[model samples]
Target: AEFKHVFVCVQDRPPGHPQGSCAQRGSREVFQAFMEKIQTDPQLFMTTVITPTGCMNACMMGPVVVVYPDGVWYGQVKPEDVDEIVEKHLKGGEPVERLVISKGKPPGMF
Candidate 1:
């Protein structure tokens, strides 16, 4: 069976922004950690992890994440927060309220 969901990484960099970028903040580390978690957790659908492009355009409030089909958006993600996002939201179908970004309205939506 194919993976049920997709998680996209959206790390942004801006010349005018105060903080640099998620990549500068070690998004690669977070990405690696996220990958490691999925590897160890059989319940986690590893194929769902998608290595995506940059500058989600929410640079002012990154590092950003989007989970498709459900249209859940989260921001200011940290490496340590990956597990909660994986276990609570992805696997268990519960949104991580603390990490959620309210202004992260999805595209193609009103």
Candidate 2:
């Protein structure tokens, strides 16, 4: 099925690993927050799809979230940041500049 939007970088790499992961930085809770919102909002359920993804290669900026179509990448995302991303970016079509990681590239070729 085609999706209007997608979120990535919900990996669970072990702690103390040389290459830190988003899960170690609390991306699970952030993913949960996104899920809760999507489940609660009928509009979102029909329009978006959020998935748990492996290392996005930006481990240093853990808890990263990349919103597709627009290609906005958010770094150090917390559970608290989910709503705004949904409201401003997902729903309203304006990317949240404050939480975005500048010069962020896609999964490969970085």
Candidate 3:
């Protein structure tokens, strides 16, 4: 299928990492929130949001989210923040400024 975007919430658990993992923080709730919010969109263009099973290497910033094709990484994301991301970046083609991690980094930098 031709997907417009892929938003993956890497909600990992700890006992390995120094601090903790994203999942241990609150990513599951945020993932549920994302599902409740974004899946309602009719113009999502086959976008898929997943809850991954590992750390996104940004444990200090729990509840991390990464968007593919653009490699936009966001940290400290909350359930309430999912709407702007889905509505703006995933649908409107304009990324949410507040959630943007790297503004204009080179490819593979993320």
Candidate 4:
């Protein structure tokens, strides 16, 4: 489909878990925010795919949102931050550098 972008949600588990967290850090909420915001613009929505990924083994750094094509991943983001991402990376302008992961990790399932 040659999608321009894919927002991957690495939501592994919830908070207070004996092993990890990130789900509680705000995965689904941000994913839904992407879905909600992207759909409004059919152009971007048709070219994009927001995936609720199982986990890229990044429980500690998640809810990790990886925007594909550009291979930009963001961590520790909140649901309210979706609009900035949408407007910045998903829709226009440069990617929101502030939320991006420090590591130059490639896109998942590329």
Question: Using lDDT as the measure, which candidate wins?
Answer: 2
Candidate 2 per-residue C-alpha lDDT over 1-110 given as tens digits, one digit per residue, 9 for 90 to 100: 22556576878777788988898899999988998888888888988988888887777877888887777788888899899988888888877888788434653455
The true-structure Cα RMSD of candidate 3 reads 3.6
Q: Record all residue pairs in model 4 with backbone atoms less than 3 Å apart, i.e. clashing.
A: none
Least well predicted 10-residue stretch by lDDT in candidate 3: 101-110
* Winning model by TM-score: 2
How far residue 102's Cα lies from its native spot in candidate 1, in Å, is 3.6
**Candidate 2 Cα outliers beyond 4 Å, as residue runs:** 1-3, 107-110
Model 3 whole-model lDDT (C-alpha atoms): 0.66
- The CA lDDT at 57 in model 1 is 53
If both were scored by lDDT, which would come out higher, candidate 2 or candidate 3? 2
Cα misplacement distance, residue 1 of candidate 3 (Å): 13
Which is the winner by TM-score between candidate 2 and candidate 3? 2
lDDT by residue for model 3 over 1-110, one digit each (tens)? 32554454555655676778777778887777777665676556256555554665556766767776676777778877878887777777777878666644422355
Q: How many residue pairs clash in each candidate?
A: 0, 0, 0, 0
Clashing pairs in 1: none
* lDDT tens per residue, model 4, 20-107: 7566676777778888888898787888888777777666677777777776778777888888887777767478888877435743
Instruction: List the candidate 3 regions with Cα displacement exceeding 4 Å.
Output: 10-17, 49-51, 103-110
